[model samples]
Target: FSQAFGIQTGDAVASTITVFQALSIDDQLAVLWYAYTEMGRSITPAAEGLLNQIKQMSHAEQLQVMRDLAAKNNTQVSRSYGILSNNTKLAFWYELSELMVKGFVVPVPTDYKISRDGSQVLEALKGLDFCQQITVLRKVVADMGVDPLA
Candidate 1:
């Protein structure tokens, strides 16, 4: 299935989608937000200190930290929040952050060029899961040199 889409099993892009699909929607979003900011890149001094403080915590503590952040922001905890192992959760964040920063932020001209089947592909992507959608979106946004959120 992935091969038809130009993705391969066990490849970074495929693996990224797999990992992201395992996360609850809320966690998926958290990963996106962290990635969107380049995972501490270009962070202000004050924010860096805060990020550092959060990074120093234990696995459970880190989860709690994000939980606190959600509460403060009037959001809910991820459904899989307490179930995921510490390493899995942290690894997911790091891997996703790196992928987003590197894969989506490159300046290119691929996004604007419409393929002969562009409309068909767009419709196909719409039917996929959130993780797959994001995977495709990263490629599109990278090629466009434009902010996906904007």
Candidate 2:
């Protein structure tokens, strides 16, 4: 299905997104919960709590949170956001946050020393929750000589 859809087989993120879009809403929510709290080696407590809160919300309420997260960093909101299931929406935010952190910690125009440090930081971030990951990333950005506060 992924191949037929043209999503790269080796890209777990893309494959997950593709598969997620095909799911019914209930299944999508279940999968989202699993990914948030169980798919990992260790559950991220903060993610679990956030998911729990979201579960208690009305569908519209939940979507507002998802939309807010998705719109961070000055990105535009589009129809693509509305078409996505809540689970996929959450997953997108999760992956986007991770990517943002990586982008901040890793120098965009790459070099050896920065690449080496960025690789190590990414590996370290794997076990961390979203907030902790951001905290660590801010520190990494600071250590790299960027003042996080301006």
Candidate 3:
């Protein structure tokens, strides 16, 4: 499937998605946080509606919603997520991480260990150029959510 998308399997792009999949869902959430914090800093203006929806949750519930989105659960949030453009989805995760920084969302614990594989995903992402980064993230975010009509 990555091949059809012109992204080589086991390469940086493919590794990101594949490795991202293997991480614990919480770690998966962290992956997006770091990806956007560093590489996706320029992405701004995520659609407002869902971000506000997430903000209303308690910190733990907010964390659960992030997991639901990453896990592609067909829930109210994911259904709302289904409507966003890839760029908007991209910005949304970035904003979520920023929310973590501000204490609005649950933050990753300092004692948490990222497996070497997870750390490599961070390394792999740095090798991509901006457009490639967008393509890669578009694929990740695009993987989320139940399409409303589906």
Candidate 4:
């Protein structure tokens, strides 16, 4: 199946579709947000702090965090935001593809507790060049660049 799309399994392409398929427009979104919160758990202390800052913000405020992140990172948050559905914009990170982009290592949260914010990560990923973006995200995570957010 992956060979058909020229995408490698267990990488960005594979992870995106797998996670996307796990969700509906609604049910899976909750999982998305929680993943972001949980991603912090898997990361370094710096990532934990950045995620905490992002966590403290209101929905609107969080959107800005993403926008700022995109801008600072040379990505397009506004365009990405446009691509996100309302559900995803609210914090369904897993649904955003950033989960896959970041290497698909993080598991979906047990109960989707921090769902809203996690969705934001997903929404932000919409504007990225899928394959390239995932590579970059993986690099970032691997290098501990997002440690502040963890």
Candidate 5:
């Protein structure tokens, strides 16, 4: 009767994070994809060769890296992920999700449909102001990755 995993968003907001956790993994990814595309290009600093490294991996490997980053596994990929700024990290996932759509990486199934609950979350997100939505997205992604060195 509890969340499968915590999404730490501090005390600022909770409903968006809670409803986000309610979606299936695929649906959650879809929400991120939607958020980035709809939210427009974020401020991005020059990334390291991270993008090249990601593209060199096989589709399965890329998917594993994405999981590692989100799961905060502190693997090589996650460690590289740690060096990035919050906006850069979010954009990195946006690129990865784009790759997934392009079949360059493990793609979401064409038959997959966003659940009713996921759609509801999107609607609520839309209800928020621009700054509010960006803060929500930043917090949503900020919980990912680990820089155990810190």
Candidate 6:
């Protein structure tokens, strides 16, 4: 399929945006973003290959994907007061969303909600470090109320 559909580069490649160039940036990034999010989705060995492919996509490609993802999902891709560059925000959200999709618990979730806290949500919240606390808050806004974990 990759060969037939031109998803892979062939002998004619000077640079090869061949497949991607056909789609709008949003569509291209949507595919790549979904692939990126799927990397650790269940801890399968295939994730490594997927991650490698995901990483190989260029910065412009990644930025396009992230921007498309934000627009498509109505996510808040910008930092508060625009303190962060669009590129930085793109990187941050990409990593964060990938973690959420993969169920990789962040520091807050790990340190607070693990075996120690068991079934106590409030107790876990109380034990979070300051940075973790901020992540908890920031992630909420970052996800734009979409529950990225879902």
Best by lDDT: 3
TM-score of each: 0.26, 0.26, 0.79, 0.26, 0.71, 0.24
What lDDT would candidate 4 get against the real structure? 0.38
Kindly provide the TM-score of model 2 when superposed on the true structure, using C-alpha atoms.
0.26
Q: Candidate 6: what lDDT?
A: 0.36
The TM-score of predicted model 1 comes to: 0.26
**Local distance difference test, candidate 1:** 0.39
- Per-candidate Cα lDDT values, in order, are 0.39, 0.36, 0.73, 0.38, 0.69, 0.36
Q: Which portions of model 6 show Cα errors greater than 4 Å?
A: 1-16, 41-65, 68-96, 99-150
Give the alpha carbon lDDT tens digit for every residue of 1-150 in model 4.
636676544555445444443443233333333334535322222222334444555655554445343333323333333343433332334333354345332232234343443354455444446444443333332321122332
Query: Backbone clashes per model, in order?
Result: 0, 0, 0, 23, 0, 0
* Top TM-score hit: 3
* Candidate number with the higher TM-score (1 or 6): 1
79-134 per-residue lDDT for model 1 (tens digits) = 23323343334343444344434542211122333333433343444455655555
Clashing pairs in 3: none
Each model's Cα RMSD: 16.7, 18.1, 4.7, 13.1, 6.9, 19.3
Report the Cα lDDT for candidate 2: 0.36
lDDT of 1 at 133: 52
lDDT of 5 by residue, 89-120 (tens): 76776676566556666634447687898788
Residue 146, candidate 6: alpha-carbon lDDT: 30
